[PDB]
Amino acid sequence: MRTYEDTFSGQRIYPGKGKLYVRGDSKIFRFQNGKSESLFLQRKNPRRIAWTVLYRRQHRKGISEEVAKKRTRRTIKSQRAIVGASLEVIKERRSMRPEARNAARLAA
Amino acid sequence: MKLNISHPANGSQKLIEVEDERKLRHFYDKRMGAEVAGDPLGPEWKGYILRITGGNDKQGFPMKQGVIAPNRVRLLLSEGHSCYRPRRDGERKRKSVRGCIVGPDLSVLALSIVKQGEQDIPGLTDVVHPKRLGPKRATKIRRFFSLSKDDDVRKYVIRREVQPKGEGKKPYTKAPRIQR
RNA sequence: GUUAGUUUUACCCUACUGAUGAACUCGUCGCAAUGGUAAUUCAGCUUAGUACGAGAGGAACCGCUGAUUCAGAUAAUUGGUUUUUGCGGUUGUCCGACCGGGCAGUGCCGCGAAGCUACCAUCUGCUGGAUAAUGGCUGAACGCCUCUAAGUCAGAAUCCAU
RNA sequence: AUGUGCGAAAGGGUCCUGUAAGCAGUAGAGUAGCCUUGUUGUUACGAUCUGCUGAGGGUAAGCCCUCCUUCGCCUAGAUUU
RNA sequence: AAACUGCGAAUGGCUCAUUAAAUCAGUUAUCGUUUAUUUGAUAGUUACAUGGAUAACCGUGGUAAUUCUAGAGCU
RNA sequence: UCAUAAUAACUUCUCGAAUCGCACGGCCUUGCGCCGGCGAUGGUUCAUUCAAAUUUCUGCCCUAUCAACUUUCGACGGCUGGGUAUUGGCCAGCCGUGGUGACAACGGGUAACGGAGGGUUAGGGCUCGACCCCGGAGAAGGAGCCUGAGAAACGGCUACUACA
């Protein structure tokens, strides 16, 4: 047992109810009552029928919004050691006292 | 249904097999790039939050970000798109890709760790891998070591060692030929 | 040989289908004399490429599952019906305009619950006794033989009952 | 014939239709005036659109519930064995 | 080697289906237009050197299937 | 109304070198200072070359049992614009009523790509030309488009029809 949804209006369908329609181009449509299929075979647009589920979501009735953009931008973490130099090598070299650097310029 | 877990911080990756569906129930109906809690996976996953990055369909098609559907759709992929590699200038080919809404149909998920938990993972967060290459441009070398305007950027470049096959000679050193 | 040409009456008696009812106080729960009587046929699987035959060809009993014609009920679902004049759309004219209404014997159109209803929809349709044809048992008349002469066994969509 | 009574209203549930009247809008193809000539300058007309609005209307006449919503009625009159 | 970037792939080769002022031939015009490349000239308005990505690569995967491709880490 | 020059302004607005290789030189205030040669690759405008697209004049077989044709929804011309690398009824509005024909229009046939040329000869002619050179068109039938100086390309892409 399972339930289906009306193609035209979105109402819930329980076993034994509604109909099943197969068109010439091998497309399958399901209906829940006589109101849906009578409107479908009349070439009506479901987006202009006020009580359909598809119409309601287009006009955003009963639904709210959420924003989480700037929260993700904060994702930053630490660093690791390159194959050439282990982690102890990099920070020792960056933290060399300026006196050694002054000696390097004069020596060179 | 397999899981592809990656750790960007430690540079480690792992693949796990999950066969029990109620643990994967909380993953359904989520979107690619969303935030999820890893608690239902197991006791060892407490305190973990994961990011959904991508997946593959049962037939093998991948998910494409920006298309909202649980099924798969045909698209006219031009140059610069994700899952297309053109063979000729200006070529456009029609292909089929699977939507960005997670569902039971997919075969593999890909996800990464955002925040570490109290417990450790036996084969994922207990090991680290080193980087491959150091910086090569002149200005990037100076910023990396926080050198001043005139600090002889030549001397501070990273150089590794390599040895010949069986010559018995000493190994030598390799350097990246600073540019700019 | 060919073409066109008025088809009257039932309220009476009986018969038939149903419906009330006087007398012995008013009621509730029961027995069953007599009258009526109902089911029908096919196909598929298996038995089996078996029995039979040189070959070509080619069956049947049980078992299982469906279908045709008929009969009695029912409306959860699907279809039909619309005076629910229930809600909506629209033409003409009338109430000064808006709102709300009249008329066009139900102005017209879309959907339409309730009720009724269709092998156009769903459910259900029993087994005892006695026998005819025929095949038999013991056994004379006729020292043999024989289903019959006395007695007796099986037995049909038949007959009588449930 | 004092009762889980009967009747008339009301509230809730369930259904059918498909978004009421009224007010407001930097919505609206455009048109006609007046000025200090505007970044919406204002005054007038305008099928339609948007908000309050899955709203409004109908619902037993052979639909359901209510001792815990309200107001009424009642141990007869006549004939016969 | 690989890979990014630049250029070529619009030349050659084949055929005669359509086509009756159409194609085509000889002869004019572009004061009515575009032009890679080649050739010759030609442009006075932090600076001792600016900023972020990506391929190759390592490593982890999906589909029976293709010169299909995913997510993670360097330059 | 050409070349060129001057003035008032304008622009999601350009270009005017943050590139590479050989040589090892010359000055004095001797500072890890200044100057200096030849090439590679780019770059704005004009000229040239290979071109390309349109365009003037004249010239094609048989047929009247094909004699009138063109303008529904441009057929001939005027004007203001739109679009194109540019001219143009190429296209959009408004306004005129025109254009071809017995000196063969229009239509039907072609076992028809055009030409340089082949075969046969007193002279005049008759007939053939798919095919090595020049021009045009096509990649099974139709349409649409990207990149690029150049394509309506098919040993490039998208869709339908027919095969597979």
PDB file of N, CA, C and O (backbone and C1' of nucleotides) in Angstrom, chain D residues 11-23:
ATOM      1  P     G D  11     -24.457  29.945  15.615  1.00  0.00           P
ATOM      2  O5'   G D  11     -23.410  29.020  16.382  1.00  0.00           O
ATOM      3  C5'   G D  11     -22.488  29.571  17.309  1.00  0.00           C
ATOM      4  C4'   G D  11     -21.828  28.501  18.143  1.00  0.00           C
ATOM      5  C3'   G D  11     -20.934  27.535  17.382  1.00  0.00           C
ATOM      6  O3'   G D  11     -19.650  28.059  17.105  1.00  0.00           O
ATOM      7  C1'   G D  11     -22.343  26.312  18.812  1.00  0.00           C
ATOM      8  P     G D  12     -18.924  27.703  15.719  1.00  0.00           P
ATOM      9  O5'   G D  12     -18.515  26.174  15.893  1.00  0.00           O
ATOM     10  C5'   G D  12     -17.405  25.814  16.698  1.00  0.00           C
ATOM     11  C4'   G D  12     -17.328  24.326  16.933  1.00  0.00           C
ATOM     12  C3'   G D  12     -17.000  23.468  15.725  1.00  0.00           C
ATOM     13  O3'   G D  12     -15.625  23.478  15.386  1.00  0.00           O
ATOM     14  C1'   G D  12     -18.787  22.494  16.896  1.00  0.00           C
ATOM     15  P     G D  13     -15.177  23.323  13.852  1.00  0.00           P
ATOM     16  O5'   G D  13     -15.543  21.812  13.500  1.00  0.00           O
ATOM     17  C5'   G D  13     -14.813  20.740  14.077  1.00  0.00           C
ATOM     18  C4'   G D  13     -15.427  19.398  13.762  1.00  0.00           C
ATOM     19  C3'   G D  13     -15.422  18.980  12.303  1.00  0.00           C
ATOM     20  O3'   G D  13     -14.163  18.489  11.879  1.00  0.00           O
ATOM     21  C1'   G D  13     -17.540  18.539  13.235  1.00  0.00           C
ATOM     22  P     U D  14     -13.653  18.758  10.380  1.00  0.00           P
ATOM     23  O5'   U D  14     -14.723  18.018   9.465  1.00  0.00           O
ATOM     24  C5'   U D  14     -14.814  16.603   9.461  1.00  0.00           C
ATOM     25  C4'   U D  14     -15.973  16.120   8.627  1.00  0.00           C
ATOM     26  C3'   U D  14     -15.947  16.508   7.159  1.00  0.00           C
ATOM     27  O3'   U D  14     -15.077  15.691   6.402  1.00  0.00           O
ATOM     28  C1'   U D  14     -18.108  16.859   8.025  1.00  0.00           C
ATOM     29  P     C D  15     -14.540  16.185   4.977  1.00  0.00           P
ATOM     30  O5'   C D  15     -15.749  15.848   4.001  1.00  0.00           O
ATOM     31  C5'   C D  15     -15.871  16.493   2.747  1.00  0.00           C
ATOM     32  C4'   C D  15     -17.311  16.678   2.345  1.00  0.00           C
ATOM     33  C3'   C D  15     -17.533  17.653   1.202  1.00  0.00           C
ATOM     34  O3'   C D  15     -17.311  17.066  -0.066  1.00  0.00           O
ATOM     35  C1'   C D  15     -19.043  18.138   2.941  1.00  0.00           C
ATOM     36  P     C D  16     -16.279  17.733  -1.095  1.00  0.00           P
ATOM     37  O5'   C D  16     -17.175  18.805  -1.856  1.00  0.00           O
ATOM     38  C5'   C D  16     -18.255  18.392  -2.679  1.00  0.00           C
ATOM     39  C4'   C D  16     -19.137  19.556  -3.041  1.00  0.00           C
ATOM     40  C3'   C D  16     -18.428  20.750  -3.657  1.00  0.00           C
ATOM     41  O3'   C D  16     -18.150  20.580  -5.033  1.00  0.00           O
ATOM     42  C1'   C D  16     -19.920  21.493  -1.990  1.00  0.00           C
ATOM     43  P     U D  17     -16.810  21.185  -5.670  1.00  0.00           P
ATOM     44  O5'   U D  17     -17.107  22.746  -5.751  1.00  0.00           O
ATOM     45  C5'   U D  17     -18.100  23.250  -6.630  1.00  0.00           C
ATOM     46  C4'   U D  17     -18.507  24.655  -6.262  1.00  0.00           C
ATOM     47  C3'   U D  17     -17.456  25.731  -6.488  1.00  0.00           C
ATOM     48  O3'   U D  17     -17.460  26.195  -7.822  1.00  0.00           O
ATOM     49  C1'   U D  17     -18.438  26.005  -4.350  1.00  0.00           C
ATOM     50  P     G D  18     -16.091  26.396  -8.626  1.00  0.00           P
ATOM     51  O5'   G D  18     -15.371  27.561  -7.821  1.00  0.00           O
ATOM     52  C5'   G D  18     -15.918  28.876  -7.773  1.00  0.00           C
ATOM     53  C4'   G D  18     -15.237  29.702  -6.714  1.00  0.00           C
ATOM     54  C3'   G D  18     -13.850  30.186  -7.127  1.00  0.00           C
ATOM     55  O3'   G D  18     -13.544  31.416  -6.477  1.00  0.00           O
ATOM     56  C1'   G D  18     -13.657  28.767  -5.264  1.00  0.00           C
ATOM     57  P     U D  19     -12.581  32.489  -7.187  1.00  0.00           P
ATOM     58  O5'   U D  19     -12.294  33.557  -6.044  1.00  0.00           O
ATOM     59  C5'   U D  19     -13.345  34.363  -5.528  1.00  0.00           C
ATOM     60  C4'   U D  19     -13.072  34.815  -4.116  1.00  0.00           C
ATOM     61  C3'   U D  19     -11.977  35.867  -3.954  1.00  0.00           C
ATOM     62  O3'   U D  19     -12.331  36.727  -2.877  1.00  0.00           O
ATOM     63  C1'   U D  19     -11.424  33.957  -2.694  1.00  0.00           C
ATOM     64  P     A D  20     -12.703  38.263  -3.157  1.00  0.00           P
ATOM     65  O5'   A D  20     -14.210  38.387  -2.658  1.00  0.00           O
ATOM     66  C5'   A D  20     -15.290  38.007  -3.498  1.00  0.00           C
ATOM     67  C4'   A D  20     -16.614  38.135  -2.788  1.00  0.00           C
ATOM     68  C3'   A D  20     -16.970  39.535  -2.315  1.00  0.00           C
ATOM     69  O3'   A D  20     -17.572  40.313  -3.334  1.00  0.00           O
ATOM     70  C1'   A D  20     -17.324  37.983  -0.557  1.00  0.00           C
ATOM     71  P     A D  21     -16.993  41.769  -3.681  1.00  0.00           P
ATOM     72  O5'   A D  21     -17.687  42.739  -2.628  1.00  0.00           O
ATOM     73  C5'   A D  21     -19.067  43.063  -2.708  1.00  0.00           C
ATOM     74  C4'   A D  21     -19.544  43.687  -1.422  1.00  0.00           C
ATOM     75  C3'   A D  21     -18.867  45.000  -1.053  1.00  0.00           C
ATOM     76  O3'   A D  21     -19.455  46.121  -1.685  1.00  0.00           O
ATOM     77  C1'   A D  21     -18.845  43.564   0.811  1.00  0.00           C
ATOM     78  P     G D  22     -18.531  47.297  -2.262  1.00  0.00           P
ATOM     79  O5'   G D  22     -17.717  47.800  -0.987  1.00  0.00           O
ATOM     80  C5'   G D  22     -18.340  48.582   0.022  1.00  0.00           C
ATOM     81  C4'   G D  22     -17.432  48.768   1.211  1.00  0.00           C
ATOM     82  C3'   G D  22     -16.132  49.508   0.939  1.00  0.00           C
ATOM     83  O3'   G D  22     -16.322  50.909   0.951  1.00  0.00           O
ATOM     84  C1'   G D  22     -15.669  47.550   2.165  1.00  0.00           C
ATOM     85  P     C D  23     -15.490  51.856  -0.037  1.00  0.00           P
ATOM     86  O5'   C D  23     -14.024  51.849   0.583  1.00  0.00           O
ATOM     87  C5'   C D  23     -13.729  52.632   1.730  1.00  0.00           C
ATOM     88  C4'   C D  23     -12.458  52.190   2.410  1.00  0.00           C
ATOM     89  C3'   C D  23     -11.184  52.517   1.654  1.00  0.00           C
ATOM     90  O3'   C D  23     -10.781  53.864   1.813  1.00  0.00           O
ATOM     91  C1'   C D  23     -11.082  50.295   2.427  1.00  0.00           C
TER      92        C D  23
END
